[PDB]
Amino acid sequence: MQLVLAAKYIGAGISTIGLLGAGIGIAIVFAALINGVSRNPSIKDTVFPMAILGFALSEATGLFCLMVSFLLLFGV
């Protein structure tokens, strides 16, 4: 096995591109909390908790595509 092994590294470097959704995604979700409390600092213990909930939702794309790389380097 050599030709099929080489495809394991090529496919692993491409599955990292799918992690952009977590970089820019979580950015926007967290950025809204910053702009939101800038116009209404009082409400805090209401938007902060839900903001974290959006994190785990956007962190999904950063986990699935992350596991795909291990299934081609330390998995297969």
Q: Which of 14, 28, 43, 56 binds other proteins (CB under 8 A)?
A: 43
Q: Which of 5, 41, 50, 53 binds other proteins (CB under 8 A)?
A: 41
Count of positions on this chain that bind other proteins (CB under 8 A) = 6
CA distance to 1, 7, 13, 54, 76, per residue, from 4 (Å): 6, 5, 15, 39, 11
Q: At what angle do helices 47-58 and 20-36 cross, to 10 degrees?
A: 170
Which residues of the shown chain bind its own copies in the complex (CB under 8 A)?
A: 1-44, 46-48, 50-51, 53-55, 57-62, 64-66, 68-69, 71-73, 76
